[PDB]
Design a protein around this ligand. Structure first.
Ligand SMILES: C[C@]12CC[C@H](O)C[C@H]1CC[C@@H]1[C@@H]2CC[C@]2(C)[C@@H](C3=CC(=O)OC3)CC[C@]12O
Ligand SMILES: O=c1ccn([C@@H]2O[C@H](COP(=O)(O)OP(=O)(O)O)[C@@H](O)[C@H]2O)c(=O)[nH]1
Length: 426
């Protein structure tokens, strides 16, 4: 059986779908991953995956998300129109080859790909890369129950700052809010609704959505073949192997978020004076905002500054004591499933809500208070590395790690749901 997979062209959307594809290929399915030209330019390793990679045009002018940032309203619709045309053309080509495609798993943020799947005679599966708790907000947004203290069914009481952040996007704010709510615009017509979460993590909201539509919780999809992009694996893991247990702060703001030069100074000085060992991912295009001699010498005593790391392998390493994170869902879930407590500095979109869930529901991290000054960051490091509170957060993270292991092992909710999905296709 031949499965097609089409993530949104950003790493936090590609990676969790890639991990699901790797699981499905292990069960015997043929996988074709559909990527933009822009994404393929960053792909460095793929041979070991055995997955076919097929590229489509970017569909907007010539990094594709940085062109999209210039005018989200216009360029997301241009990307949509081009994606519809070019995925149609690609499927038409794939229909001249055996085995014929049978299902298209597509990013939930591109709900209009469902029309392409059905027009081509394929089943359509929408893949949600955010937790059900956050996705629920987007549904209520579409229904008009909420726009842009807040009570919503089966969610903790939220402060305004805890709702998904779109005001940060300025003139793009309206376009981004529309994109998020539209994830539910055709949910009744989707053949399969997949969420990268596990039931025990959000019992009540999963049960609530399950009462409206049959949904399949299949997360964590995360488990070499684990990475498509350059991860600097040998440098990172040789350095971690030199650190004792529970001594390293891992720091990453993901694949998209950019901090101002003012904000990165506060992070830099906070890390130096904590006198903690640290591994800080600073993307190549963001290095020029680091203080003068930070990467070259003053970080050399206690730190590793790297433009990308193998995040799954880093979070699994016993040396890592905590994870200073922007709270994107992959990072949150990967830390939770690795037993690693967090320092939350959310930037925008669902990160704000994820940070609330981390601190107050799952209780595996602490939040910083706003610019975030270095003094606040060092305080949070002390709470997690030294204080009794940090030992509680660590124990809580280990309990969630155990429940996530249960979910993906035989008999667990996510294993059962991936089995149900696989069997449905046969
Ligand atoms: C506005 C934004 C801000 C961050 C970067 O500057 C990139 C731009 C354009 C791309 C845009 C992000 C803001 C976040 C996004 C809506 C993000 C998504 C979040 C989601 O749930 O579905 C898509 C992917 C990337 C995104 O489409
Ligand atoms: O040095 C890094 C930093 C991040 N990641 C991966 O990049 C994705 C980050 O996604 P997330 O949802 O956390 O945030 P986003 O980048 O979408 O804002 C995840 O797959 C991380 O595992 C990584 O492999 N190496």
């Amino acid at each position: 059986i031949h499965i097609l997979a089409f993530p949104f062209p950003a790493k936090g959307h590609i990676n969790p779908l890639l991990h699901l594809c790797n699981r499905l290929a292990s069960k015997g399915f043929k996988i074709t991953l559909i990527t933009t030209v822009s994404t393929l330019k960053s792909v460095k390793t793929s041979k070991a995956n055995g997955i076919d990679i097929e590229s489509i045009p970017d569909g907007i002018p010539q990094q594709i998300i940085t062109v999209m940032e210039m005018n989200m309203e216009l360029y997301f619709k241009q990307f949509k129109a081009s994606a519809i045309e070019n995925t149609t053309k690609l499927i038409q080509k794939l229909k001249t080859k055996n085995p014929l495609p049978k299902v298209l798993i597509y990013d939930s943020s591109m709900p209009w790909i469902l029309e392409v799947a059905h027009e081509q005679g394929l089943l359509g599966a929408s893949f949600f890369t955010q937790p059900c708790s956050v996705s629920a907000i987007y549904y209520h947004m579409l229904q008009g129950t909420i726009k842009l203290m807040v009570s919503l069914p089966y969610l903790p009481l939220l402060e305004i700052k805890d709702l998904p952040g779109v005001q940060q996007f300025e003139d793009n704010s309206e376009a981004v809010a529309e994109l998020l709510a539209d994830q539910f615009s055709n949910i009744d017509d989707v053949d399969y609704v997949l969420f990268n979460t596990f039931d025990a993590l959000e019992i009540e909201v999963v049960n609530w959505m399950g009462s409206k539509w049959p949904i399949l919780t299949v997360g964590p999809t995360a488990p070499s073949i684990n990475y498509l992009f350059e991860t600097n694996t040998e440098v990172c893991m040789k350095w971690l192997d030199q650190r004792e247990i529970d001594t390293v702060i891992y720091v990453s703001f993901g694949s998209l978020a950019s901090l101002t030069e003012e904000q990165m100074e506060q992070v830099s000085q906070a890390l130096i004076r904590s006198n903690c060992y640290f591994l800080w991912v600073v993307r190549e295009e963001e290095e020029n905002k680091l203080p003068k001699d930070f990467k070259e010498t003053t970080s050399k005593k206690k730190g590793l500054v790297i433009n990308w790391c193998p995040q799954l392998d880093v979070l699994a390493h016993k040396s890592v004591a905590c994870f200073m994170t922007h709270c994107g869902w992959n990072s949150t879930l990967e830390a939770l499933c690795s037993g690693v407590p967090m320092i939350c500095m959310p930037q925008w979109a669902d990160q704000t809500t994820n940070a609330k869930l981390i601190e107050h529901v799952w209780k595996i991290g602490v939040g910083v208070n706003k610019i975030v000054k270095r003094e606040e960051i060092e305080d949070c490091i002390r709470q997690v590395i030294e204080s009794e509170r940090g030992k509680e957060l660590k124990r809580n993270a280990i309990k969630w790690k155990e429940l996530a292991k249960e979910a993906v092992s035989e008999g667990g909710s996510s294993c059962n749901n991936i089995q149900e999905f696989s069997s449905s296709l046969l």
